[PDB]
A paper describes a structure:
NleE, a virulence effector from EPEC, is a SAM-dependent methyltransferase that modifies a zinc-finger cysteine in TAB2/3 in the NF-κB pathway. We recently discovered that NleE is a SAM-dependent methyltransferase that modifies a cysteine in the NZF domains of TAB2/3, thereby disrupting ubiquitin-chain sensing of TAB2/3 and abolishing NF-κB-mediated proinflammatory responses. NleE-catalyzed cysteine methylation of TAB2/3 is the first example of enzyme-catalyzed protein cysteine methylation, representing a novel mechanism in regulating signal transduction in eukaryotes. NleE harbors no sequence homology to known methyltransferases.
Wild-type NleE yielded poor crystals, but NleE K181A protein, out of 15 Lys-to-Ala mutants designed to improve the crystallization, produced sufficient-quality crystals in the C2 space group. A model obtained from 2.6-Å diffraction data collected on the selenomethionine (Se-Met) protein was further refined and a final resolution of 2.3 Å was achieved. Despite the presence of four NleE in an asymmetric unit (chain A–D), NleE was exclusively a monomer in solution as judged by gel filtration chromatography analysis. The structure of NleE (residues 21–220: residues 1–20 and 220–224 lacked electron density) adopts α/β doubly wound topology with a central three-stranded anti-paralleled β-sheet (β1–β3) sandwiched by α-helices (α1–α10). β1–β3 are arranged in the left-right-middle order, which, together with the flanking α-helices (α8–α10), generates a deep and narrow cavity on the left side of NleE. The SAM molecule fits snugly into the cavity, which buries 2374 Å2 solvent accessible surface area, corresponding to 76% of the total surface area of SAM and leaving the rest of 24% exposing to the solvent. The interior of the SAM-binding cavity is filled with hydrophobic side chains, but polar interactions appear to play a key role in riveting the SAM into the cavity. Specifically, the α-carboxylic group of the amino acid moiety of the SAM is coordinated by the side chain of Arg107 situated on a loop connecting β1 and α6. The hydroxyl group of the ribose of the SAM is hydrogen-bonded with the side-chain carboxylic group of Glu191. The adenine ring of SAM is oriented by the aromatic ring of Tyr212 residing at α10 (residues 206–219) through a π-π stacking interaction. Remarkably, the overall architecture of NleE does not resemble any of the five families, thus representing a completely novel class of methyltransferases.
Author numbering: 21 to 52, 54 to 220
Write the structure that this text describes.
């Protein structure tokens, strides 16, 4: 149904478990044979979808850097992509029944790579990209590589050497992330200086 539709490769057991507290904002069932709420899911999704269709645009002949500020919320994270300002963004959802996530997946040439958040039981990462630009998938893939490097590093440090593991792992991949997220070169420098200070 609505979940396998946007997240084909999802674990089978997911639907055996019962709705967590976040799911319940949008559904009501014993398991994950639950009803979609008419107002909170169906009607919210349709409203958000209209909003997205209005803002939808095609990609420029070429992208310009956005400010990090335009993509610091989940909503701006995908808005900058659907309006064609940049080829990819990444955000999180506390429920695979998030109405925005479902609306996002119904836009032309808009793809979402979805997977469970590392070290979290309910959170999923969403990587949203322009399929109508060759940079879309490339950047989405490149993010997953950088993301895997970060989490591999942090897991290892967590295991054997935990001090400042998060900030250390940022020093390793943060500039590369900034670039693929299209942040302005100045904002990326400023972030590396913030990480450096954390030393
Ligand atoms: C936390 S992810 C958030 C992604 C955001 N929702 C998007 O779609 O662009 C942004 C990552 O980019 C890196 N980064 C580089 N420059 C940054 C900056 N100026 N502000 C925030 N993150 C920056 C950090 O590693 C950070 O984890």
């Amino acid at each position: 149904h609505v979940v396998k539709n946007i997240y084909p490769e999802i674990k089978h057991d997911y639907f055996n478990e019962s709705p967590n507290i976040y799911d319940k904002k949008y559904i009501s069932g014993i398991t994950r044979v639950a009803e979609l709420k008419q107002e909170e899911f169906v009607n919210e999704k349709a409203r958000r979808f209209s909003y997205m269709k209005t803002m939808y645009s095609v990609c420029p002949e070429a992208f310009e850097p956005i400010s990090r500020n335009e993509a610091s919320t989940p909503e701006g994270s995908w808005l900058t992509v659907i309006s064609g300002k940049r080829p990819m963004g990444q955000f999180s959802v506390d429920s695979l029944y998030n109405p925005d996530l479902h609306a996002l997946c119904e836009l032309p040439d808009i793809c979402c790579k979805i997977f469970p958040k590392e070290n979290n039981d309910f959170l999923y990462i969403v990587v949203v990209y322009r399929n109508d630009s060759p940079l879309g998938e490339q950047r989405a893939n490149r993010f997953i590589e950088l993301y895997n490097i970060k989490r591999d590093i942090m897991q290892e440090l967590n295991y054997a050497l935990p001090e400042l593991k998060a900030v250390k792992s940022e020093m390793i991949i943060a500039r590369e992330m900034g670039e693929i997220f299209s942040y302005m070169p100045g904002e990326i420098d400023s972030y590396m200086k913030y990480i450096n200070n954390k030393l």
